[PDB]
Design a protein around this ligand. Structure first.
Ligand code: NAG
Lengths: 48, 50
């Protein structure tokens, strides 16, 4: 199972992680049953 | 989940992912029934010494 937990927190701070407490509610459980050792993030490019 | 008790309306704000509630003794304290998705409170039936 791939368990994903999430929480949206409206902030107004500039640079660092805001200091506080906020529990993360689960979104979905994914019956992948696969091997995972690495991960990579997906971004978007801006073209003018 | 098998058990015995009185099923009443509950005012406990279950979050959407939450299914059932548990007490200290690990017995079920509340339940979300299928086909209605509404939150039911479970209270044990009356008992005591005679
Ligand atoms: C059947 O159960 C689903 C939950 O799995 C619920 O969303 C749906 O409303 C139920 N349908 C009826 C007719 O009770």
């Amino acid at each position: 199972y791939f368990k994903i937990y999430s929480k949206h927190t409206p902030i107004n701070l500039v640079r660092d992680l805001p200091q506080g407490f906020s529990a993360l509610e689960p979104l979905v459980d994914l019956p992948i049953g696969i091997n995972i050792t690495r991960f990579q993030t997906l971004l978007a490019l801006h073209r003018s | 989940l098998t058990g015995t008790g009185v099923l009443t309306e509950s005012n406990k704000k279950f979050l959407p992912f939450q299914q059932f509630g548990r007490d200290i003794a690990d017995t079920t304290d509340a339940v979300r029934d299928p086909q209605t998705l509404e939150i039911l409170d479970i209270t044990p039936c009356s008992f005591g010494g005679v």
